[PDB]
Amino acid sequence: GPVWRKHYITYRINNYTPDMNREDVDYAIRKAFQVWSNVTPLKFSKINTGMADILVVFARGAHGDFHAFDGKGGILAHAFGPGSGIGGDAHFDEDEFWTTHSGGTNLFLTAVHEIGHSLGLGHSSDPKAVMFPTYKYVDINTFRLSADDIRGIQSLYG
Ligand SMILES: CCCCCC[C@H](CC(=O)O)C(=O)c1ccc(C#Cc2ccc(Cl)cc2)cc1
Ligand SMILES: [Ca+2]
Ligand SMILES: [Ca+2]
Ligand SMILES: [Ca+2]
Ligand SMILES: [Zn+2]
Ligand SMILES: [Zn+2]
């Protein structure tokens, strides 16, 4: 049907992963959402029934990701552009070992990046902006966002 929205976005979480703790995914995804929403004119909303805009699914390198990247570290996940259905969703290398709160890779870091890809604009290309390709494990404790960066996205279409 006729799709043309620019404020209210939908979201859906996969089966809470097989390993990754569900409560952990909700907390990490919740915090990232507030950071992306509180810095954006477009509010977001998760559900668990009807179709949604940003869909988060856990899979191992196979369906793409450049002939299946890794499954034990390296990258964490990726997301596509707009569109419908599949478009706007992301895939996290579930095969690997994810660590909630601490122990390695946090869901928050991937949640913020994955989310920004769906809504957030282009990247910065610079070892500092929460979007750049270069991966660097960093507990959310230091996950800080430049005022100019967040202010630019909110000031653009907001
Ligand atoms: C050109 C292909 C890019 C692949 C790079 C790996 C992939 C990119 C993506 O998420 O889309 C990935 O899984 C990934 C890459 C970077 C990060 C990060 C980060 C980060 C580091 C430090 C700070 Cl302060 C903030 C964020 C996460 C996942
Ligand atoms: Ca990985
Ligand atoms: Ca989608
Ligand atoms: Ca896993
Ligand atoms: Zn993928
Ligand atoms: Zn990116």
Curated annotation (Swiss-Prot):
Q: Binding positions for Zn(2+) 1?
A: 63, 65, 78, 91
Q: Which residues of this UniProt protein bind Ca(2+) 1? A: 19, 94, 96
Induction context: By exposure to bacterial lipopolysaccharides (LPS). Inhibited by dexamethasone.
Question: Which residues of this UniProt protein bind Ca(2+) 3?
Answer: 70-71, 73, 75, 93, 96
Q: Can you tell me which residues bind Zn(2+) 2?
A: 113, 117, 123
Q: Where in the cell is it found?
A: Secreted, Extracellular space, Extracellular matrix
Q: Which residues bind Ca(2+) 2?
A: 53, 85, 87, 89
Tissues in which the UniProt entry reports expression: Found in alveolar macrophages but not in peripheral blood monocytes.
Q: Where is the active site?
A: 114
What's said on domains?
The conserved cysteine present in the cysteine-switch motif binds the catalytic zinc ion, thus inhibiting the enzyme. The dissociation of the cysteine from the zinc ion upon the activation-peptide release activates the enzyme.
Q: What does this protein do?
A: May be involved in tissue injury and remodeling. Has significant elastolytic activity. Can accept large and small amino acids at the P1' site, but has a preference for leucine. Aromatic or hydrophobic residues are preferred at the P1 site, with small hydrophobic residues (preferably alanine) occupying P3.
Per the similarity annotation, which family is this?
Answer: Belongs to the peptidase M10A family.
* Protein name, UniProt field: Macrophage metalloelastase
Q: Which residues of the full protein are shown?
A: 106 to 263 of 470
